[PDB]
Amino acid sequence: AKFRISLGLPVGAVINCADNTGAKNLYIISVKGIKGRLNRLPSAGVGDMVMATVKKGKPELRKKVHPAVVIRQRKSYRRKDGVFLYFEDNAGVIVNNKGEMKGSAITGPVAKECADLWPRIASNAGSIA
Amino acid sequence: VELCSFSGYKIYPGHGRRYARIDGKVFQFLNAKCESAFLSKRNPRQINWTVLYRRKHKKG
Amino acid sequence: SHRKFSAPRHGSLGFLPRKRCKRHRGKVKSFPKDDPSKPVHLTAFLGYKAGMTHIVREVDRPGSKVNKKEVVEAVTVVETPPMIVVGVVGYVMTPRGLRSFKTIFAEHISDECKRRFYKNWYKSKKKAFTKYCKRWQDEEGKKQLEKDFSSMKKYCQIIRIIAHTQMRLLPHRQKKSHLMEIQLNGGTISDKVDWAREKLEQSIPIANVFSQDEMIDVIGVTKGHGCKGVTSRWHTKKLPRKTHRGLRKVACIGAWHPARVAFSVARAGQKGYHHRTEINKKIYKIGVGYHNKDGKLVKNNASTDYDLSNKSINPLGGFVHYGEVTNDFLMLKGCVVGTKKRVLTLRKSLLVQTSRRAQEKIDLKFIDTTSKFGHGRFQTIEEKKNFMGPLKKD
RNA sequence: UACCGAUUGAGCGGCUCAGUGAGGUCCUCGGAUCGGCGCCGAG
RNA sequence: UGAACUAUGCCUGGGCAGGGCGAAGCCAGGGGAAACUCUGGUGGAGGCCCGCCGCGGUCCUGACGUGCAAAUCGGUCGUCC
RNA sequence: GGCGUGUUGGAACAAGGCAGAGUAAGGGAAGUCGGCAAGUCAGAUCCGUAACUUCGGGAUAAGGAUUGGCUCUAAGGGCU
RNA sequence: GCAGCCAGCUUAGAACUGUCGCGGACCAGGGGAAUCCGACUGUU
RNA sequence: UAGUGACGCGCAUGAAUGGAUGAACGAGAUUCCCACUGUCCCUACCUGCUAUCUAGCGAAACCACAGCCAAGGGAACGGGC
RNA sequence: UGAUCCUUCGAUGUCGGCUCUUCCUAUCAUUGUGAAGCAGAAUUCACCAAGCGUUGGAUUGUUCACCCACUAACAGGGAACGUGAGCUGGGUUUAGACCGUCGUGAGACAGGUUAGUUUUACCCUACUGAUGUGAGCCGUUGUUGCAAUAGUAAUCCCGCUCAGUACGAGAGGAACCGCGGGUUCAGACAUUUGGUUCGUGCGCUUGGCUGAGGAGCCACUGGCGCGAAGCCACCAUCUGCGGGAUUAUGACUGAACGCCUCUAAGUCAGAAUCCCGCCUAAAAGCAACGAUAGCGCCGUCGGAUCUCCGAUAGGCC
RNA sequence: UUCUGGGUCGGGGUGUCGUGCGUGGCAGAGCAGCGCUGCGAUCCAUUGAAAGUCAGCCCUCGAUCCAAGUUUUG
Ligand SMILES: [Mg+2]
Ligand SMILES: [Mg+2]
Ligand SMILES: [Mg+2]
Ligand SMILES: [Mg+2]
Ligand SMILES: [Mg+2]
Ligand SMILES: [Mg+2]
Ligand SMILES: [Mg+2]
Ligand SMILES: [Mg+2]
Ligand SMILES: [Mg+2]
Ligand SMILES: [Mg+2]
Ligand SMILES: [Mg+2]
Ligand SMILES: [Mg+2]
Ligand SMILES: [Mg+2]
Ligand SMILES: [Mg+2]
Ligand SMILES: [Mg+2]
Ligand SMILES: [Mg+2]
Ligand SMILES: [Mg+2]
Ligand SMILES: [Mg+2]
Ligand SMILES: [Mg+2]
Ligand SMILES: [Mg+2]
Ligand SMILES: [Mg+2]
Ligand SMILES: [Mg+2]
Ligand SMILES: [Mg+2]
Ligand SMILES: [Mg+2]
Ligand SMILES: [Mg+2]
Ligand SMILES: [Mg+2]
Ligand SMILES: [Mg+2]
Ligand SMILES: [Mg+2]
Ligand SMILES: [Mg+2]
Ligand SMILES: [Mg+2]
Ligand SMILES: [Mg+2]
Ligand SMILES: [Mg+2]
Ligand SMILES: [Mg+2]
Ligand SMILES: [Mg+2]
Ligand SMILES: [Mg+2]
Ligand SMILES: [Mg+2]
Ligand SMILES: [Mg+2]
Ligand SMILES: [Mg+2]
Ligand SMILES: [Mg+2]
Ligand SMILES: [Mg+2]
Ligand SMILES: [Mg+2]
Ligand SMILES: [Mg+2]
Ligand SMILES: [Mg+2]
Ligand SMILES: [Mg+2]
Ligand SMILES: [Mg+2]
Ligand SMILES: [Mg+2]
Ligand SMILES: [Mg+2]
Ligand SMILES: [Mg+2]
Ligand SMILES: [Mg+2]
Ligand SMILES: [Mg+2]
Ligand SMILES: [Mg+2]
Ligand SMILES: [Mg+2]
Ligand SMILES: [Mg+2]
Ligand SMILES: [Mg+2]
Ligand SMILES: [Mg+2]
Ligand SMILES: [Mg+2]
Ligand SMILES: [Mg+2]
Ligand SMILES: [Mg+2]
Ligand SMILES: [Mg+2]
């Protein structure tokens, strides 16, 4: 399915929250699907589901663990058509363990590598690019 | 085949580096020189070697 | 005393020792198994790494997320001028391996091929094969020559041909041709000696050995980097900053017992310039060299069915540190070992190519010819002058 | 039932410092174009 | 037998950029029924602040560690009326 | 004013060191006993400065804006 | 009551101007909220 | 298992063997936050001086003899048997 | 963990971590299986089996714990309780100092706390790479090769499909083939993207210097922006593989033992194992072939002379 | 080691940077003298100019030189 992209969001990366859930930041604590290496930090790209905690936002969200999905990143990744695309910010949306988002709208664009894996996120994306 | 958003040059499907912003505007750049000047908020119509400069000053 | 956390070993022990190859040219250590049902054909070829570029093609991969869509894949240009078969050697099977039975060379051997026989060619009376070439004219020599061919058809099981490259048709400073034995895996020993006897002192193009969208093996010597530390040679983790007496080292090179350093412990030494054999390199395009069709130079070997341009495989300013490819080239997917202008040993696959990726028919849609000597932004000089207009040099 | 209380409090809400800033107006320009017919006009 | 190092004391000498905060004292102007207060300026006190020389010697547990040196070097750093 | 680079020259520019407090995409202490290390800040001008306090301070608190070049304007003196 | 002449060096304001860059090198405090101990400066 | 605020039959706190508090100060010990960064993910590249090679010059530590291993036994972990 | 005190007190550097290699299996996962109180799914027991993998963090100096997540699984260990001329000194374990308890006291604590020099390799091996090497000979020299032996490498996962199917009353819920990707690792590589730039390449710029312009220099690379070539990054890209004998196990024929029986004789299938191939190295191992500077041949049984070095004492039946 | 070949320059290509010096301007906040003239950062044109570009880029298109001689081997 998804081809390998350049990962640029290791653990401990505070990315912006790009939905109307009330959260502003997403402190990535781990990434789904990462087996592991002796010292390698679990990194994530766009379209990867991560476990994140909110650092700034509503009190009912900033002390728990939330499954998030990265939709934008500043690390330029290469697509199969030889295009290196990067965004001006690292963004993510809070979702469930099955892909359903908690919010209803998404500010800013959403990477195509994220909209194709998560159709529930692509429906709330104002611009898929 | 795209055109550079800063220099106006023609970008081929293997070169370049496109850059999408939060406001939904996607910009293609030929190389890092056009990209670095774009992020520096440089005016292409004042950069002497760009297409927008040669069109503004009617050099062609 | 077991290591605290598990971690795989750094590097492979199957590429030991990490020494300089005693042989600059790539060596075929295993030719494809003989199939007598096929016609007599070559199983290897010598090429020269010109440089890399990227192409554009529509992938036909049912089930993939990129099917029916264009991609940009990196390719390597391997200039392969036709090789001249100047000899033939027969091997007899022995309970201690193959053995060179007898070798027969052609009558006329090119000067560039004779340079291989010498270390100081400029001050040597070029007398190599001067008493040997008289066998093809003397009556006693031709009779003994007929017996040597009939002896190879009778006492040999593996027939190889000695062919050299045409260094005269290459941008290299080197004039020494590269000799090589190319095993014939076609049919009967009598058919392979007859085929080799006919092809003596004749050229063999790259299009007659390899075919389109065929996965071949590339043998050659990698690029040398001199003596490199254990952090670059084996990619061991760099020690912390406050480490006294060096942080680019391996901390523990072995336990107390055994009271010796093991061969599997990563040490510092020569990195690069090793013999390697990479397989499954698909040929994306078998180019055609420069030729005069009707008195005009034909250099359209980079035009595709969708470009219809008049550009050659050479980028603007030629390949960096190599030159220009005026001969037949071979476009291989991805990268291959060696520096620029490095002699590459191409070889057919030992395996069966039946996978979806192996038998995939490639149809290039665009070949990039922008200058690799910087950030080239023009495919041809014609569009560089059309886009920029007249300069002050005009 | 109120008060004190670490939490370096906080869901909660108003005017504002400094940034960034859509959108419109205006201005300086731009001149795709069609009516004359190779210059005045609209744009 | 030693205070030519060092510890303390005594006698007679020598020495310590440029800035900062800015106290008493003083001047003038406002507010008040008066008690008196407020503002500006002046003034230049201090085991006061930054900091150069000097005197010290925090960290890097840096360099060095058969050294330049039987204790040194570099940056950093303490103090500097 | 002094001097030949501090008890030697020449040729190379591998590893590994020491130093340049070299630089480094994306992340930003996940490193480590520990932000060790050096990175940030920095001058000046104009604004704005809390908790607490022995009322002295804290304080350059914190947080902002400005800074070039050129051509002018205005004000700040002395003397007969 | 000033006219003439002479003398600097600062300060403020404005236009214009270059790639918004300008203490451009050099020089040159990271900050905040708390705990413990010793008041401080000094000394070892 | 840290820090802070509480709780106190406190193994074994306590009032000039001073208790409690505390602004300012600290190259003191500790915790957190922002900013910041190659500390790390994950290393790479460049420079100087070295190492290296060369001309000249030219030490020292150390040394029973020496110097490939496995097992065995042995003063219970050989290099020699 | 003790017990012992055999080795070491003219010293074997002392906890942990970091780093790195290999090994053991008492197998967590993965491969092939047997068993169930195995319907499916999940799980448990057991067998061949150490090939391969076994993580990122919070707290503590910690081994050990505990928790957060991730994961096929996050199995347990050894190698002087691996590993300090490898590191780091946080801890313990000098001298400074504080507290508590104890002591009349000097002081003690197996209690807590803070600050506290981690020296040397150029020697021999081992290993890593780099020259060279059979001192005897018609050998010298070159090309193309063969090859003993040694190394050895790939790994695991997910999605689609099968299929909402088998199975089940339902709830739930697989698998083989096939397809598309990814994890870890290995070997490369620079077209592209990104990093580096003392090509000191070009622009700009601070202070100063040559009277100024122009052109430049200086400040141990003045600074800044961009930056070629090189080198380089799972931070870009490419590639990673086939057989044989068999293990566990399930069977065939078939006695012993009129039946039965996978075993006794004889057979079959059979794996992340093993061996090999592929791949890397190339030997006091070797082949073919080229060219061989007055130097060398058959002379036919060369004749006649001086020197060394083996044996052997009819046989290649 | 002269049928030639190998260097050094030059040219071209390529790429890098970014529009050189000079000159002109009825561009220039202005200001100072007598519309003229002087001073004046910047601006425009010449001018995608100038500069440098293999030393490990590419191609010769020309120019001008160069050809020796260390040791040893049956
Ligand atoms: Mg670690
Ligand atoms: Mg050639
Ligand atoms: Mg150290
Ligand atoms: Mg290039
Ligand atoms: Mg004294
Ligand atoms: Mg200070
Ligand atoms: Mg000082
Ligand atoms: Mg001093
Ligand atoms: Mg010091
Ligand atoms: Mg200190
Ligand atoms: Mg420290
Ligand atoms: Mg030290
Ligand atoms: Mg040393
Ligand atoms: Mg000198
Ligand atoms: Mg001296
Ligand atoms: Mg180095
Ligand atoms: Mg360094
Ligand atoms: Mg630095
Ligand atoms: Mg970085
Ligand atoms: Mg930590
Ligand atoms: Mg850690
Ligand atoms: Mg520090
Ligand atoms: Mg404060
Ligand atoms: Mg308290
Ligand atoms: Mg004190
Ligand atoms: Mg006190
Ligand atoms: Mg003090
Ligand atoms: Mg913490
Ligand atoms: Mg407490
Ligand atoms: Mg008491
Ligand atoms: Mg009392
Ligand atoms: Mg007491
Ligand atoms: Mg202190
Ligand atoms: Mg011994
Ligand atoms: Mg006894
Ligand atoms: Mg010792
Ligand atoms: Mg001893
Ligand atoms: Mg020892
Ligand atoms: Mg077992
Ligand atoms: Mg059981
Ligand atoms: Mg033990
Ligand atoms: Mg130990
Ligand atoms: Mg050791
Ligand atoms: Mg040590
Ligand atoms: Mg230790
Ligand atoms: Mg300590
Ligand atoms: Mg002590
Ligand atoms: Mg301590
Ligand atoms: Mg200390
Ligand atoms: Mg680049
Ligand atoms: Mg200047
Ligand atoms: Mg000048
Ligand atoms: Mg100086
Ligand atoms: Mg400097
Ligand atoms: Mg740069
Ligand atoms: Mg089999
Ligand atoms: Mg059986
Ligand atoms: Mg069988
Ligand atoms: Mg050259």
A68, A92 Cβ separation under 8 angstroms: yes
**Experimental method for this entry?**
cryo-EM
Instruction: Count CB-CB contacts under 10 A for residue C254.
Output: 13
Q: Is B60 on the interface with A (CB under 8 A)?
A: no
Task: Retrieve residue C303's tokens.
Answer: 């035009």
Q: Quote the CA–CA distance of B33 and B50 in Å, as a whole number.
A: 11
A10, A70 Cβ separation under 8 angstroms: no
C347, C336 Cβ separation under 8 angstroms: no
C349, C280 Cβ separation under 8 angstroms: yes
Instruction: Count CB-CB contacts under 10 A for residue C17.
Output: 9
Q: Which residues contact C359 (CB under 8 A, 6 or more apart)?
A: C213, C353
The phi, psi pair for C342, rounded to 5°, reads -100, 130
Q: Which residues contact C383 (CB under 8 A, 6 or more apart)?
A: none
Task: Choose the mutation target among A35, A81, A85, A114 for the interface with C, i.e. most C CBs under 10 Å.
Answer: A81
Burial of B48 (0-12, 13-18, 19+ CB in 10 A): exposed
Burial annotation C308-339 (CB, 10 A radius, 16+ → b, else e): ebebbbbbbebbeebbbbbbbbbbbbeebbbe
Q: Quote the CA–CA distance of C218 and C337 in Å, as a whole number.
A: 8
Q: Quote the CA–CA distance of A78 and A40 in Å, as a whole number.
A: 22
H/E stretch holding A1 reads none
Where are any strands of DSSP class E within C334-394? 342-348, 364-367
Burial of C110 (0-12, 13-18, 19+ CB in 10 A): middle
Burial of C287 (0-12, 13-18, 19+ CB in 10 A): buried
**Which of B10, B13, B31 is closest, CB to CB, to C72?**
B13
Q: Residue C306's closest CA among C58, C50, C26?
A: C58
DSSP B44: G
Burial annotation B1-11 (CB, 10 A radius, 16+ → b, else e): ebebbbbbbbb
Task: Retrieve residue C28's tokens.
Answer: 């075929």
Task: Retrieve residue A79's tokens.
Answer: 């697509």
Contacts of A86 in chain B (CB under 8 A): 17, 19-20
A82, B13 Cβ separation under 8 angstroms: yes
Nucleotide nearest to C381 (CA to C1'): J13
**At how many Å resolution was this determined?**
2.4
CA-nearest residue of chain C to A36? C7
Q: Quote the CA–CA distance of A129 and B21 in Å, as a whole number.
A: 10
Task: Choose the mutation target among B15, B17, B49 for the interface with C, i.e. most C CBs under 10 Å.
Answer: B15
Q: Is B32 on the interface with A (CB under 8 A)?
A: no
